[PDB]
Structure formats: C-alpha cells, structure tokens
C-alpha cells in the first residue's frame, strides 16, 4: 500500500552517491 520502503531505500542510496560528490568536491579544492 505505502511505497515507503521504495523511497526509503532510494533516500539512503542517494546519500552514498552524494557522499562521494561532496567529498570529491571538497577535496578537489
């Protein structure tokens, strides 16, 4: 009924991908 698990998984996965971008940019400098 509630697609909470779907979004919940994506939300967590996004953090992993976003973590690299953030750490990559920060250090890039």
Curated annotation (Swiss-Prot):
Task: Give the Asparagine amide positions (modified residues).
Answer: 28
Disulfide bond sites: none
Lineage top rank: taxon? Eukaryota
The UniProt gene name for this protein comes to VIP
Q: Give the taxonomic lineage as stored in the record.
A: Eukaryota, Metazoa, Chordata, Craniata, Vertebrata
What does the protein in this record do? VIP is a neuropeptide involved in a diverse array of physiological processes through activating the PACAP subfamily of class B1 G protein-coupled receptors: VIP receptor 1 (VPR1) and VIP receptor 2 (VPR2). Abundantly expressed throughout the CNS and peripheral nervous systems where they primarily exert neuroprotective and immune modulatory roles. Also causes vasodilation, lowers arterial blood pressure, stimulates myocardial contractility, increases glycogenolysis and relaxes the smooth muscle of trachea, stomach and gall bladder.
> Under what name is this protein listed?
Vasoactive intestinal peptide
């Amino acid at each position: 009924h509630s697609d909470a698990v779907f979004t919940d998984n994506y939300t967590r996965l996004r953090k992993q991908m976003a973590v690299k971008k953030y750490l990559n940019s920060i250090l890039n400098g």
